[PDB]
């Protein structure tokens, strides 16, 4: 997260860390949607152009975390994966269309003060909340700058980071990139003339873009951190998987399995 700040403890109790076993590294963010299901980006697990193809045995899911590096003995839960599901029409070749994946935990997790699921939106919520100019929130343990001086500069945060970004009009999204954007994506970020900055960055991928409803007080996941061109560049915007447009797939997978 570029130009964000430290999360408060328990601020994002649905934030999940995807953790590689060997070598030990942070792979991606994710979010908890029930006691046995985790939602992430497809490209966190499968991207053939860089020979990335992770398996149930390659990964751990860590839930309830605040610090990036500590083993938070009292608070975090570490789970193994039973099964990974990737959208059948995930397009890694040209534009990362349908960048979405589900993961089933081997055992259910107990909720607590630090572990709690986020709501997925219904039709009325999606139509009300997903409008240009409205602000959502992104969280993650990814990089603090696009680039920094080796062994001197900052790089990675020590605790979870948070930033609030406005949804941007579809025509401005289109003009800003040569990539063919579909209706399964939206873009967020400040415009060059607005004087505030912020973006997701390497390692934030797969994390939730969430919005709060003022009428019932609940948090909804509207997006998944998907892709961008660098981090926090002027005239550039991050792109997010459109969670609602893909809800029917989620529904199929959870119901059948």
């Amino acid at each position: 997260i570029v130009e964000g700040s430290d999360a408060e403890i328990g601020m994002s109790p649905w934030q999940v860390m995807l953790f590689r076993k060997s070598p030990q590294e942070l792979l991606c963010g994710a979010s908890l949607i029930s006691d046995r299901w985790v939602l992430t980006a497809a490209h966190c697990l499968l991207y053939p152009p860089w020979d990335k193809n992770f398996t149930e045995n390659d990964l751990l899911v860590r839930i309830g975390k605040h610090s990036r590096t500590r083993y938070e003995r009292n608070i975090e839960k570490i789970s193994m994966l039973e099964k990974i599901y990737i959208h059948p029409r995930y397009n890694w070749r040209e534009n990362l269309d349908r960048d979405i994946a589900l993961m089933k935990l081997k055992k259910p997790v107990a909720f607590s003060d630090y572990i709690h699921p986020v709501c997925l939106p219904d039709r009325e919520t999606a139509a009300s909340l997903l409008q240009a100019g409205y602000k959502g929130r992104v969280t993650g343990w990814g990089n603090l700058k696009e680039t920094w001086t080796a062994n001197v500069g900052k790089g990675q945060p020590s605790v979870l980071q948070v930033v609030n970004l406005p949804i941007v009009e579809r025509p401005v999204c289109k003009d800003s990139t040569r990539i063919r954007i579909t209706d399964n994506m939206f873009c967020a970020g400040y415009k060059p003339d607005e004087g505030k900055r912020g973006d997701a960055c390497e390692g934030d991928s797969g994390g939730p873009f969430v919005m709060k409803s003022p009428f019932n007080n609940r948090w909804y996941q509207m997006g998944i951190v998907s892709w961008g061109e660098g981090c926090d560049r002027d005239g550039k915007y991050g792109f997010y998987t459109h969670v609602f447009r893909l809800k029917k797939w989620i529904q199929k997978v959870i119901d059948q399995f």
Binding site: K21, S22, Q24, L60, T69, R70, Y71, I78, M80
Partner: peptide
Amino acid sequence: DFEEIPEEYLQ
């Protein structure tokens, strides 16, 4: 720079 986690999860 990660603190180590129980080896049961990593074997």
